[PDB]
Each structure stands twice: as C-alpha cells, then as structure tokens.
Structure 1
Amino acid sequence: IGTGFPFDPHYVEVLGERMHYVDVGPRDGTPVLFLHGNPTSSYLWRNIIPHVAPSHRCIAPDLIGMGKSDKPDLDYFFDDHVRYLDAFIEALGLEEVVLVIHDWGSALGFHWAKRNPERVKGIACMEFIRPIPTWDEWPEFARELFQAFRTADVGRELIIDQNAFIEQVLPKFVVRPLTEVEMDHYREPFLKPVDREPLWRFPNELPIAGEPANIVALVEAYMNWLHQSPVPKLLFWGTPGVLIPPAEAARLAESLPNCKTVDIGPGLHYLQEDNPDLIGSEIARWLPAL
C-alpha cells in the first residue's frame, strides 16, 4: 500500500477561500468526484485514484478547513461544508458527475445528488452516513469514545487538545496498522490545535439518537431519495464495519435500486486504507457500464 501522494496540487477560489484538489486523468468525458470525510483529505484516495485515472478524470477536493484547503474561522457545521462544496463544483464548471463518497463526504454527495439528480451518473459509496436511531447501533468498541466526543467540555478536550480524531480514531478504524509516514500525512493539516474545530463538530453533527434533529431530517431526506433513485450504485463494505455493518450492507444490497455490493474483506471505517486496490479496480470496471 502506497504511502506517497504523487499528485500535482490544484487550488480554486471558493467563496473567498482556496480549496485544494487533485485533478488527474483525461479531460473530455464525465469526471469522477471523490469526497473524503473526517478527519481525512484527498490523501485518503491516493491509492484508489490510479486505478480510475487511466480512463476517467479524477477530481478529489480537500474540504474547507481540512487537507491543504484554507482554514476560515467557521463553526464548520455541515451546512458550511455544503455551501463550499456547492461552490467548488460550480467553480470548476462541472456538468454531470460520478460520485465516489465516504463518511461526511457521503452526506455531502448524497445531499448534492438529491438536489441535482439529473447531474449524477453514478454513486460509489462506502461507510456512508445514515440515521443511527440509538447508540446500540454504534459499535461497542467505539461507543464510549464517541459518546465522550458529544459530551460538553470532554469532547473538545479529546479532539482539540489531545487530537484524538487523528491519533486514536484513525488507527482504531483501520484494520491493518498505519505507518508513521501515513500518520504524518494525516497530522499535517492539524498541527495547530485551533485548526481541529471541524474534527470536533463533525462527530457532533452525526445523526445519532435523533440529534441534531436538522441533520437527522436531512439525512432521512437523501436516504429516501437514494432508495427511489435509478442512478447506478456501487457499495463497498467490510467486516465488521462501523457505520455499515455486514447485516446493514445486506439489507442495502436488496433495498437500494440498481446497486452492486463489493465485500472488501476485513474493514472498519477507512476501508480505503484496508483494500484500496479492490475499491479502485471495481470502480474502474464499473464506470464504462454507466
């Protein structure tokens, strides 16, 4: 598994802030837009993109306040990310797209898809955000941790002061051991504690136990759209998973229209770090059929 990030940097100005993105592959057909989540960046996609780039344009932005993108003094609510991503897509003059999405990147992607259904040609997804009705549906191996993340004072102490989302959550949710080089790549955006605001707000935006109500409503909305959309879908899952356990992937395999599922083997949350070659190769095999 490659530790390097051999991609020329690109920046586009979005609402007075520069957003970094990877942009490789041929420029004529439909682009594949890769959307990371918390606490990652386009670095998450580094070993997946090379399978896809030979045949298709790969665009992978770093979300505002993350990766190599500018870091405005925002609250970094989900709605903030929505506004910047909406503006990024229009800034590049993208028409139709294929989405490849994960975690908060999936919330963003699905919400964009619901609002622009005519412009989405396919969705490849993995460990995506769905309503979590109770904490019983959250893996026992991370229940107290994320409960603490959403507790007053304690949450900020763990995520901001101690950098728990980088130093604990990342290794905890990758089955194979991450190298020091890989950790340093993930560390680089958040060397300054103050810049960890998005890493704390994201877990506090998760639709868990009916709160926050607005996000629950929004996620329910795009899941309702997804369940009745004819757009081709490719769902990657792992055992035992985090957001999408095997049993959930099985239900989605039946319920989601026009959906193919791919079992990546052992996986938690950052499936891209466990089996990037299978994820990349399957996306590549899938795209020409769109």
Structure 2
Amino acid sequence: EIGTGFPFDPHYVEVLGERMHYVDVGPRDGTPVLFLHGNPTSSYLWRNIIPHVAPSHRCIAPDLIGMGKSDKPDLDYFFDDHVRYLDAFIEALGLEEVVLVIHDWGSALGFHWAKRNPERVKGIACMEFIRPIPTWDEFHHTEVAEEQDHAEAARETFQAFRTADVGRELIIDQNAFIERVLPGGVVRPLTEVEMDHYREPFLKPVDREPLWRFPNELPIAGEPANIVALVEAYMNWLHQSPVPKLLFWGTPGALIPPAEAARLAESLPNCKTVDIGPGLHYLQEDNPDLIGSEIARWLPAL
C-alpha cells in the first residue's frame, strides 16, 4: 500500500499514571472502532486502513504500553502488563461498546477483552490472530508443499527467540523483530520512511524488551501454562460467540494460512472472510485498501 504518511492528530491520554499515544478520528460516536496493533508495530500499522472507516465511524488506535509513542514505564512487559494498560485506557477513554479490529498480539488482547466484556463487543474484524499452538509442527502450519520449507525456517526462527540468550542478542541487540521479522512478514518491499517509522520507537536496545517478551509469551507447547489457558479460553469463547466476525486472509498467510481461514469460515459463527490476495503476516502493509473497504462495508449492518 503506497500510503506512507501518518498525519493523525497527536492524542495522549493518561493510564495507570502513564502516557499513551493513540489515534482518534471520526464523527465521535455511533459505535467506536478500536484498532489494536500487535508486535512489533504501533498505530503506524493501521494508518492506511483507518481512513476508509473514519468517514462513518470513530476510529481509535492505541499504541500499546512501552510501545510506539507511548511511555516506556520500566517493566518486564508480560502479557498481563498489556492486558492491564489497555483495560485502563478503554475506561480512560470511557468507551462503552466497541467494534474491534485486531491484529497479531493485538488480537490476544482484543479477544481477551471481549471474552471478559462480551456485551460490549459489537463486532470483531481480525487477521493473523494468536490462537493455541499445541505443538510446533503446528506453528506456521501448512498443507501446501511448496511452502513446507518456509514454515520450518519460521519454526526455527521462533525457536531461537524462546531460548536462553539469543532471544536477547537477536531481538534486543540485533533488533531481529524490526529489522528482519517485520519486513519479512510483508510480501512487497518496505520503503525506508516506512522502516524509520517502525524503527523510531526503538533506537535503544535497552528498549527492545517488549519485542522480546512477546515471542516468549507465545502460547506454544503449553508454554507458558498461564497464557495458554486464556487463549484456549477465548478461542473457546469465540467459537461460541454470536458476534458477527470479519477475518481477513492472504496466501501464503502465516499464523493463519488459507486452509485455516477456510476452516474458520465455519468454525466461527457469523463469520465472513475476505481474501486480500498475496500476503504474509503483516497484511496491513500488503493490501490495506481492501481491508478498509470491507471494514467500512461490514460496519453499518452491525
């Protein structure tokens, strides 16, 4: 998506005693849309999708704590830390019912906030989201042959992130997530302005900590027992939830290759899928016009 700039109004609310940047655009009612980014992104991630929606809805796009232009409170950045800071923000913005547009680790928070706040979620638009990974032969799974190689590489890649010192060398000293994994996850080439934008919140290896904690929070193998249980928990909720669902996909996909999205087209009730064409993991950067066109369209009848 040609869209290279981030012209939004520089808003900042305070949360559990801490500043959080966010994007607020749109009429300023109906039912607000929350765009929750994952790792290792920020509001910059939703920047060309949101304009499709603002014409009709209020688009809010928080920058996770320790992430983006938010504040870097000094903490480990587990998953509950983020759970906490959102929940405080949401109340801070005093927003009542929402529609949710949620990405990678942004969907873990999204689905978790919804499973705890069912009658507050008016709809769920999602794409490459975090669900339970029983084993590794299951991570980045695929039943297309020509791609069995790529899933292995990735499997090994996340392998390293989760191991004693190499997680920290790679992700932290060498900024693996920003410098290789991100641009990795987008099919087309990523301009330097686009990179600088993603790089910016991150010029200090001492700060890369969250882009490290996330990989190790990943519910792979029943590790860590705790996150796992809440992902089994909201995927169980989701699987049973009437809330209308919008799930976007891409070939070869990543966390959700085409096989699953097709499965999830029936596995999840009241669920339309949309094919964004060639894409990897960071779909927002491959075909963001469509993603917004179809959010725009999917909303009114909610």
Indicate the residue corresponding to 1:34 in structure 2.
Answer: 35
Secondary structure, counterpart of 1:167 in structure 2: helix
1:43 counterpart = 2:44: yes
Cα displacement (A) at 1:241: 1.2
Separation in structure 1 between the aligned mates of residue 184 and residue 282 of structure 2, nearest angstrom: 10
Separation in structure 2 between the aligned mates of residue 135 and residue 267 of structure 1, nearest angstrom: 22
Cα displacement (A) at 1:130: 0.3
Separation in structure 2 between the aligned mates of residue 231 and residue 63 of structure 1, nearest angstrom: 25
Cα displacement (A) at 1:143: 1.5
1:160 counterpart = 2:172: yes
For residues 90-129 of structure 1, what are the structure 2 equivalents within 5 Å?
90-129=91-130
Separation in structure 2 between the aligned mates of residue 56 and residue 2 of structure 1, nearest angstrom: 20
Q: TM-score, normalised by structure 1?
A: 0.99
Identity within the alignment, %: 98
Separation in structure 2 between the aligned mates of residue 200 and residue 35 of structure 1, nearest angstrom: 19
Separation in structure 1 between the aligned mates of residue 237 and residue 208 of structure 2, nearest angstrom: 32
Separation in structure 2 between the aligned mates of residue 221 and residue 135 of structure 1, nearest angstrom: 20
Separation in structure 1 between the aligned mates of residue 158 and residue 279 of structure 2, nearest angstrom: 19
**Cα RMSD, aligned residues only:** 0.6
Cα displacement (A) at 1:137: 2.0
Separation in structure 1 between the aligned mates of residue 239 and residue 19 of structure 2, nearest angstrom: 35
1:203 counterpart = 2:215: yes
Cα displacement (A) at 1:28: 2.3
Cα displacement (A) at 1:145: 1.1
Secondary structure, counterpart of 1:289 in structure 2: coil
Separation in structure 2 between the aligned mates of residue 136 and residue 175 of structure 1, nearest angstrom: 23
| 1:248-270 residue CA offsets vs partner (Å, 9 max, x unmatched) | 11111011000000011111110
Gaps of 5+ in 2: 140-151
Gaps of 5+ in 1: none
Cα displacement (A) at 1:8: 1.0
| 1:31-52 residue CA offsets vs partner (Å, 9 max, x unmatched) | 0000000000010000000000
Aligned length: 289
Cα displacement (A) at 1:144: 1.4
Runs of 4+ in 1 over 6 A off after TM superposition: none
Separation in structure 2 between the aligned mates of residue 33 and residue 104 of structure 1, nearest angstrom: 14
Secondary structure, counterpart of 2:14 in structure 1: strand
Cα displacement (A) at 1:273: 0.3
| 1:164-186 residue CA offsets vs partner (Å, 9 max, x unmatched) | 10000011110001001100000
Cα displacement (A) at 1:153: 0.6
| 1:20-67 residue CA offsets vs partner (Å, 9 max, x unmatched) | 000001012110000000000010000000000000000000000011
Cα displacement (A) at 1:192: 0.8
Separation in structure 2 between the aligned mates of residue 122 and residue 184 of structure 1, nearest angstrom: 33
Separation in structure 2 between the aligned mates of residue 48 and residue 76 of structure 1, nearest angstrom: 27
Cα displacement (A) at 1:13: 0.4
Secondary structure, counterpart of 2:298 in structure 1: helix
Cα displacement (A) at 1:141: 3.2
| 1:177-198 residue CA offsets vs partner (Å, 9 max, x unmatched) | 1001100000000001111000
Separation in structure 2 between the aligned mates of residue 181 and residue 159 of structure 1, nearest angstrom: 21
Separation in structure 1 between the aligned mates of residue 84 and residue 38 of structure 2, nearest angstrom: 16
Secondary structure, counterpart of 1:61 in structure 2: coil
Secondary structure, counterpart of 1:135 in structure 2: coil
